[PDB]
Design a protein around this motif. Structure first.
Motif, PDB file in Angstrom:
ATOM      1  N   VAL A 256      20.631  -1.396   8.334  1.00  0.00           N
ATOM      2  CA  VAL A 256      19.713  -1.669   9.422  1.00  0.00           C
ATOM      3  C   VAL A 256      18.373  -2.068   8.817  1.00  0.00           C
ATOM      4  CG1 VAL A 256      18.489  -0.696  11.401  1.00  0.00           C
ATOM      5  CG2 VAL A 256      20.831   0.026  10.885  1.00  0.00           C
ATOM      6  N   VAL A 257      17.786  -3.148   9.318  1.00  0.00           N
ATOM      7  CA  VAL A 257      16.484  -3.579   8.822  1.00  0.00           C
ATOM      8  C   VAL A 257      15.495  -3.642   9.978  1.00  0.00           C
ATOM      9  CG1 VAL A 257      17.500  -4.963   6.971  1.00  0.00           C
ATOM     10  CG2 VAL A 257      16.943  -6.030   9.172  1.00  0.00           C
ATOM     11  N   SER A 258      14.213  -3.581   9.645  1.00  0.00           N
ATOM     12  CA  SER A 258      13.160  -3.654  10.643  1.00  0.00           C
ATOM     13  C   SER A 258      11.882  -4.051   9.927  1.00  0.00           C
ATOM     14  CB  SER A 258      12.956  -2.293  11.312  1.00  0.00           C
ATOM     15  OG  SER A 258      12.305  -1.396  10.430  1.00  0.00           O
ATOM     16  N   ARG A 259      10.851  -4.382  10.692  1.00  0.00           N
ATOM     17  CA  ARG A 259       9.579  -4.730  10.088  1.00  0.00           C
ATOM     18  C   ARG A 259       9.083  -3.440   9.433  1.00  0.00           C
ATOM     19  NH1 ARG A 259       5.590  -7.988  14.164  1.00  0.00           N
ATOM     20  NH2 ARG A 259       4.410  -6.066  13.737  1.00  0.00           N
ATOM     21  N   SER A 260       8.440  -3.559   8.277  1.00  0.00           N
ATOM     22  CA  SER A 260       7.957  -2.377   7.568  1.00  0.00           C
ATOM     23  C   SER A 260       7.121  -1.446   8.437  1.00  0.00           C
ATOM     24  CB  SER A 260       7.143  -2.789   6.336  1.00  0.00           C
ATOM     25  OG  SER A 260       6.045  -3.610   6.704  1.00  0.00           O
ATOM     26  N   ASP A 261       6.256  -2.016   9.267  1.00  0.00           N
ATOM     27  CA  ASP A 261       5.398  -1.202  10.119  1.00  0.00           C
ATOM     28  C   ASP A 261       6.125  -0.450  11.238  1.00  0.00           C
ATOM     29  OD1 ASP A 261       5.624  -4.036  10.883  1.00  0.00           O
ATOM     30  OD2 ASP A 261       4.275  -3.599  12.516  1.00  0.00           O
ATOM     31  N   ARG A 262       7.419  -0.718  11.408  1.00  0.00           N
ATOM     32  CA  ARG A 262       8.212  -0.060  12.448  1.00  0.00           C
ATOM     33  C   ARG A 262       9.352   0.798  11.885  1.00  0.00           C
ATOM     34  NH1 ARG A 262       7.232   1.130  17.256  1.00  0.00           N
ATOM     35  NH2 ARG A 262       9.311   0.511  18.013  1.00  0.00           N
TER      36      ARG A 262
END
Ligand SMILES: *[C@@H]1O[C@H](CO)[C@@H](O[C@@H]2O[C@H](CO)[C@@H](O[C@@H]3O[C@H](CO)[C@@H](O[C@H]4O[C@H](CO)[C@@H](O[C@H]5O[C@H](CO)[C@@H](O[C@H]6O[C@H](CO)[C@@H](O)[C@H](O)[C@@H]6O)[C@H](O)[C@@H]5O)[C@H](O)[C@@H]4O)[C@H](O)[C@@H]3O)[C@H](O)[C@H]2NC(C)=O)[C@H](O)[C@H]1NC(C)=O
Ligand SMILES: *[C@@H]1O[C@H](CO)[C@@H](O[C@@H]2O[C@H](CO)[C@@H](O[C@@H]3O[C@H](CO)[C@@H](O)[C@H](O)[C@@H]3O)[C@H](O)[C@H]2NC(C)=O)[C@H](O)[C@H]1NC(C)=O
Ligand code: NAG
Ligand code: FE
Ligand code: ZN
Ligand code: ZN
Length: 340
Positions: A256-262
């Motif tokens: 699973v990936v996401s924006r670093s800030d999230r």
């Protein structure tokens, strides 16, 4: 705020996402795109929070600043003392599969044959096999190696899409989502099984999960593992039972990936969601199971036991490994939102 927007790729994943949303009481919401690349863009724009990706896409997402959060973990024999969420990932085996009846076909006689790929840019279906072929061939014309192929994501007018079938009505031919009949691990194996292609580039697990009565699916009901053979890099052919000594490479698990800030927020929600709809979740069997979709691997692979923490808070490069990273870079030399 404490809500997560998942990005579904295609109409089938969208529908499963909607069921997850409803059962989650809005803690999880859905956004839909026609391709994985489009989902990555939504995440970058902040209109979606996360999605599960094959290693090839993690490379693309990583150059754009997205980070791995939790990884798919499948039930393994070793490391049985630790809990799944804390268990280290082992990766999966990328293999080349053919029909036993297609005698004489080996890794050294693949040129001019017909191929089935999960999708362009994916690990086992594209990056590994084409990376090996380009090197051994010393040519960047990987679009001229096989006579015809089904490689979702390529030009629908090219020979790389000649074998793709589209949906029930013949529409969306070669689109890189489940609408395409031969898309993904299951679709590429089906492409081989129905003798559309001579070879399929998938993972070890795909063969086992779709043979000897494991699927019940109309096209896979009568498939027997003995009618298949793996192509080894030494020119040999072996039974599917010998994948440990006859594979193209070991690939990093989908994650699973996401924006670093999230990242922190996404991790929190997911850990709670799997406790509810995971393998031994409070409501999986009875109401909803996150890791089930009748062999179609929607949102997550069906053989996923749990989503595991990474440990060592790795960057995308550390997660994929220097071995694989340089392999993709070299293949890419042949070929915002391409952020690097
Ligand atoms: C390549 O990939 C394969 C597939 O991922 C890897 O093989 C698995 O390896 C693990 C770890 O070494 C083995 O561990 C076992 O896992 C089983 C669960 O999958 C446990 O066995 C019980 O549960 C099985 C699943 O339900 C069940 O099925 C298996 O055996 C029967 C007949 O022997 C067949 O199907 C039955 O279950 C299906 C499920 O829906 C159902 O449709 C049928 O009605 C049957 O009831 C089928 O052959 C299947 O393999 C078992 O009968 C049993 O009830 C077990 O306790 C243990 O945890 C695991 O056995 C392997 N999985 C499979 C599917 O074979 C392999 O290791 C990889 N190779 C390399 C080199 O990495
Ligand atoms: C296709 O061929 C290319 C060219 O050989 C392969 O790239 C090379 O991959 C090797 C193995 O990962 C790299 O070697 C490593 O180099 C580092 C230092 O650079 C060293 O610390 C390691 O111990 C190891 O020796 C090599 O650098 C790399 N070459 C280039 C130019 O990047 C590529 O892996 C092949 N593709 C496939 C799918 O096999
Ligand atoms: C929804 O999220 C809230 C806030 O964390 C939590 O208390 C609740 O148990 C969750 N319910 C479901 C069904 O996920
Ligand atoms: Fe993959
Ligand atoms: Zn190996
Ligand atoms: Zn680090």
């Amino acid at each position: 705020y404490t809500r997560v927007v998942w990005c579904a790729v295609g109409p089938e994943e969208q529908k499963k996402c909607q069921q997850w949303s409803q059962q989650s009481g809005q803690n999880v919401t859905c956004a839909t795109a026609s391709t994985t690349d489009d989902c990555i863009v939504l995440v970058l724009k902040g209109e979606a929070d996360a999605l599960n990706l094959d290693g090839g896409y993690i490379y693309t997402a990583g150059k754009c600043g997205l980070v791995p959060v939790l990884a798919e973990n499948r039930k393994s024999s070793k490391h049985s003392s630790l809990d799944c969420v804390l268990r280290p990932t082992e990766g999966y085996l990328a293999v080349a599969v053919v029909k036993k009846a297609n005698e004489g076909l080996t890794w050294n006689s693949l040129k001019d044959k017909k191929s089935c790929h999960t999708a362009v840019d994916r690990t086992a279906g594209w990056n590994i096999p084409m990376g090996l072929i380009v090197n051994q061939t010393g040519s960047c014309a990987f679009d001229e190696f096989f006579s015809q192929s089904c490689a979702p994501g390529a030009d629908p007018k090219s020979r790389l899409c000649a074998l793709c079938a589209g949906d029930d009505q013949g529409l969306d031919k070669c689109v890189p989502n489940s609408k395409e009949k031969y898309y993904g691990y299951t679709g590429a194996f089906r492409c081989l099984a129905e003798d559309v292609g001579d070879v399929a580039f998938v993972k070890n697990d795909t063969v086992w999960e779709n043979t000897n009565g494991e699927s019940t699916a109309d096209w896979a009901k009568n498939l027997k593992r003995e009618d298949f053979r793996l192509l080894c890099l030494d020119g040999t052919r072996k039974p599917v039972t010998e994948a440990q000594s006859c594979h193209l490479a070991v690939a990093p698990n989908h994650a699973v990936v996401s924006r670093s800030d999230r990242a922190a927020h996404v991790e929190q929600v997911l850990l709670h969601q799997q406790a509810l709809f995971g393998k031994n979740g409070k409501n999986c069997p009875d109401k909803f199971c996150l890791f089930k979709s009748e062999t179609k691997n929607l949102l997550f692979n069906d053989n996923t036991e749990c989503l595991a923490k990474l440990g060592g808070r790795p960057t995308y490069e550390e997660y994929l490994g220097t071995e694989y990273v340089t392999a993709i870079a070299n293949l890419k030399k042949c070929s915002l939102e391409a952020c690097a």
